[PDB]
């Protein structure tokens, strides 16, 4: 094939394919997050 | 964040009376009623240690 890049798609926090998903509470802090956040939002251009 | 210290209505100090409070409702099998053993006859302020949220253990773990 060719595996070529085609623009970029903004991910939604706490998803099946997010950077967190299966992360334990004790490890959410290390990352400066909050065990209460329930995702739902996008952080495009720096703002929710 | 941490007990208020000095109840809202009276002056009765409550900064002292928590390091000892929590060591009963989870460490002596006494009731919410146990605070009565801390000189809390008034409403009053005694709804101070009771209606409180320990928001610092869960805030302190953000180390710079
Ligand atoms: Zn009072």
Residues of each annotated binding site of B for Zn(2+):
7, 10, 44-45
Q: Does A45 touch chain B (CB under 8 A)?
A: no
| Entry resolution (Å) | 3.7
Number of domains in chain B: 1
Q: Within 10 Å of residue B49's Cβ, how many Cβ atoms? A: 21
**Experimental technique used to determine this entry:** X-ray
What six digits make up the tokens of B57? 């253990």
Q: What is the domain-level CATH number for residue B33?
A: 1.10.10.60
Say yes or no for a CB contact (<8 Å) between B61 and A32. no
Q: What residue of B is the nearest CA neighbor of A33?
A: B62
| Contact in structure between A18 and A43 (CB atoms under 8 Å) | no
Compute, in angstroms, the gap from residue B38 CA to the centroid of ligand 1.
13
What residues make up the domain containing B19?
A: 1-64
Q: Nearest-CA neighbor of B33 among B41, B3, B13, B14?
A: B41
Residues 6+ apart with CB under 8 A from A33: A20
């Amino acid at each position: 094939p060719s595996k070529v890049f085609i623009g970029k798609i903004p991910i939604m926090l706490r998803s099946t394919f997010c950077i967190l998903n299966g992360v334990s509470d004790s490890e959410l802090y290390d990352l400066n997050e909050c065990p209460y956040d329930q995702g739902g939002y996008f952080i495009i251009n720096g703002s929710e | 964040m941490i007990i208020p210290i000095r109840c809202f209505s009276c002056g009765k100090v409550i900064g002292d009376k928590w390091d000892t409070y929590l060591t009963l409702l989870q460490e002596d099998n006494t009731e919410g009623e146990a605070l009565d053993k801390l000189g809390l006859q008034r409403y009053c302020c005694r709804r101070m240690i009771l209606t409180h949220v320990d928001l610092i253990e869960k805030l302190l773990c953000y180390n710079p």
